Amino acid sequence: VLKGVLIECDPAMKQFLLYLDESNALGKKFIIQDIDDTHVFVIAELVNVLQERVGELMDQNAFSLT
């Protein structure tokens, strides 16, 4: 059995996380278990960098008016 964090979101973000896992963007393969098309299993020790990457992807194609 595994101990960690289940992450649920739209399939686009799941595919983005899979691309990050295969490209070693975070430096390792910590995206370990895939259970569903919209659910993934991730070790909680580095969830913060995943949030940072998601935020960077989100605000990259945003064109903030500030």
Next chain:
Amino acid sequence: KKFDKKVKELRRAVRSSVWKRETIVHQHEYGPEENLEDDMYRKTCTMCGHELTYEKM
């Protein structure tokens, strides 16, 4: 130049119909499990070196 263009416009037509699958399958084919302390079991993927550590009840 027109001859070169009219052969080029059909040169890539046959080429585009050759390749079928672009995405590479990344299935994790773990081998035999290794037993560590505290009832820990580790599986190593033979395709990319992926490691999965879990606890078996």
